[PDB]
Scaffold this active site. Structure first.
Site, PDB file in Angstrom:
ATOM      1  N   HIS A   1       8.322   2.944 -11.308  1.00  7.55           N
ATOM      2  CA  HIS A   1       7.326   4.013 -11.499  1.00  7.55           C
ATOM      3  C   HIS A   1       5.945   3.369 -11.296  1.00  7.55           C
ATOM      4  CE1 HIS A   1       5.265   7.313 -13.894  1.00  7.55           C
ATOM      5  NE2 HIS A   1       4.343   6.318 -13.929  1.00  7.55           N
ATOM      6  N   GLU A   2       5.713   2.224 -11.971  1.00  9.84           N
ATOM      7  CA  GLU A   2       4.364   1.621 -11.853  1.00  9.84           C
ATOM      8  C   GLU A   2       4.078   1.057 -10.473  1.00  9.84           C
ATOM      9  OE1 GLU A   2       1.865   2.095 -13.788  1.00  9.84           O
ATOM     10  OE2 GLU A   2       3.089   3.173 -15.166  1.00  9.84           O
TER      11      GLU A   2
ATOM     12  N   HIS B   1       2.789   3.570  -8.130  1.00 10.74           N
ATOM     13  CA  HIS B   1       1.338   3.919  -8.194  1.00 10.74           C
ATOM     14  C   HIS B   1       0.575   3.091  -7.156  1.00 10.74           C
ATOM     15  CE1 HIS B   1       1.129   6.724 -11.356  1.00 10.74           C
ATOM     16  NE2 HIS B   1       1.601   5.939 -12.321  1.00 10.74           N
TER      17      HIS B   1
ATOM     18  N   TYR C   1      -6.593  10.273 -10.490  1.00 11.64           N
ATOM     19  CA  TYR C   1      -5.832  10.277 -11.721  1.00 11.64           C
ATOM     20  C   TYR C   1      -6.323  11.334 -12.696  1.00 11.64           C
ATOM     21  CZ  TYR C   1      -2.174   8.317 -14.574  1.00 11.64           C
ATOM     22  OH  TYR C   1      -0.967   8.091 -15.188  1.00 11.64           O
TER      23      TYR C   1
ATOM     24  N   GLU D   1       1.600  11.114 -11.105  1.00 13.28           N
ATOM     25  CA  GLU D   1       2.648  10.684 -12.070  1.00 13.28           C
ATOM     26  C   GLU D   1       4.053  11.096 -11.654  1.00 13.28           C
ATOM     27  OE1 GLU D   1       2.537   8.739 -14.647  1.00 13.28           O
ATOM     28  OE2 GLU D   1       0.775   8.224 -14.090  1.00 13.28           O
TER      29      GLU D   1
ATOM     30  N   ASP E   1      -5.306  13.501 -22.061  1.00 13.42           N
ATOM     31  CA  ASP E   1      -4.446  12.834 -21.070  1.00 13.42           C
ATOM     32  C   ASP E   1      -4.948  13.083 -19.665  1.00 13.42           C
ATOM     33  OD1 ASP E   1      -1.991  11.536 -20.086  1.00 13.42           O
ATOM     34  OD2 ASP E   1      -1.030  13.483 -19.966  1.00 13.42           O
TER      35      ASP E   1
ATOM     36  N   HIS F   1       0.362  13.272 -17.652  1.00 11.00           N
ATOM     37  CA  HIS F   1       1.706  12.942 -18.059  1.00 11.00           C
ATOM     38  C   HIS F   1       2.482  14.188 -18.543  1.00 11.00           C
ATOM     39  CE1 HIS F   1      -0.281   8.986 -18.417  1.00 11.00           C
ATOM     40  NE2 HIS F   1       0.835   8.617 -17.811  1.00 11.00           N
TER      41      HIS F   1
END
Ligand SMILES: [Ca+2]
Ligand SMILES: [Ca+2]
Ligand SMILES: [Ca+2]
Ligand SMILES: [Ca+2]
Ligand SMILES: [Zn+2]
EC number: 3.4.24.27
Length: 316
Positions: A142-143, A146, A157, A166, A226, A231
């Site tokens: 997932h990271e 990015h 973002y 996300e 957020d 998210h």
């Protein structure tokens, strides 16, 4: 470091044994020269200064409990690189074999992991909410996804573009988890989240509402927390992606699944050719439809399923 490429052995966060690519030059370092310009893993030694020291070991065996998070950060960055290369023909996150760097043991009791614009950073968790976050292959992928998005669509973002950003990371994290065939599922973070509770996870793509995230555009979060819900509102896109792949009937709308492989090809194409930094959900729908059209024809079942899935989550 300059040295000889070799292979060492260790144990990951979950206790599983694995071989990792290392480099020898006096010490053995977590430096994998077999993929692109290299994968490098660093020890941040419970501080927040980055990247820390390139991980050095005296005998090439990584079975200490302090070694675990480093073994899995290093190994799962190599699996994610292989997925993007073998499945999508992309060499590293910039498309030109950029070196992948990760630091583990960041800060103390830190319940998160992130791509900071230059490298990966992993906390060890507080031991209750999370165990060291690099033990989750879907988290790692997932990271690292990015970083792919940063070099391609550049989705900002916040608000709907951040929620797309996300969701794209959850989709590809899940596809890497299926590619490695590591007990795969459509949940995110289940291997490292709350060691004392079985069955839960941070988010769910197959049923985002299980954890209270929206699964339809009419339930989206509109406040400011957020970064405007990046998210939270990602659940709407995650549910759409789960339906495209697996099919199902959601709020009365029926979707015939076309499978994970085509899901990955449509979204990778949409991400690298049609999304821009300020794309919103409606533009993601157009981009996914155009991608499926490019690949399979405007009268294919694949185009029809993309349309039904976005109609099922209320995105026009
Ligand atoms: Ca050792
Ligand atoms: Ca799993
Ligand atoms: Ca998972
Ligand atoms: Ca748990
Ligand atoms: Zn993310």
């Amino acid at each position: 470091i300059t040295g000889t490429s070799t292979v060492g052995v260790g144990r990951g966060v979950l206790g599983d044994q694995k071989n990792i690519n290392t480099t020898y030059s006096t010490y053995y370092y977590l430096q994998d020269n077999t993929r692109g310009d290299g994968i490098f893993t660093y020890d941040a030694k419970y501080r927040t200064t980055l990247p820390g020291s390139l991980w050095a070991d005296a005998d090439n065996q990584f079975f200490a409990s302090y070694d675990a998070p480093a073994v899995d950060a290093h190994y799962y960055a190599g699996v994610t690189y292989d997925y993007y290369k073998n499945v999508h023909n992309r060499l590293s996150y910039d498309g030109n074999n950029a070196a992948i760097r990760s630091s583990v043991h960041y800060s103390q009791g830190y319940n998160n992991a992130f791509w900071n614009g230059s490298e990966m950073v992993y906390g060890d968790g507080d031991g209750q909410t999370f165990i060291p976050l690099s033990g989750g292959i879907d988290v790692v992928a997932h990271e690292l996804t990015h970083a792919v998005t940063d070099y391609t669509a550049g989705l900002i973002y916040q608000n709907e573009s951040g929620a797309i950003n996300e969701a794209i990371s959850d989709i590809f994290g899940t596809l890497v988890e299926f590619y490695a065939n590591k007990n795969p599922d459509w949940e995110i973070g289940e291997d490292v989240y709350t060691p004392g509770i079985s069955g839960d996870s941070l988010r769910s793509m197959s049923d985002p509402a299980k954890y209270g995230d929206p699964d339809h555009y009419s339930k989206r979060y509109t406040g400011t927390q957020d970064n405007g819900g990046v998210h939270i509102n990602s659940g709407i896109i995650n549910k759409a992606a789960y339906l495209i792949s697996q099919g199902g009937t959601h709020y009365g709308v029926s979707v015939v699944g076309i499978g994970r492989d085509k899901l990955g090809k449509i979204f990778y194409r949409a991400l690298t050719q049609y999304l821009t930094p300020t794309s919103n959900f409606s533009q993601l729908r157009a981009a996914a439809v155009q991608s499926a059209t490019d690949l399979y024809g405007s009268t294919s079942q694949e185009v029809a399923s993309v349309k039904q899935a976005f109609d099922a989550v209320g995105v026009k």
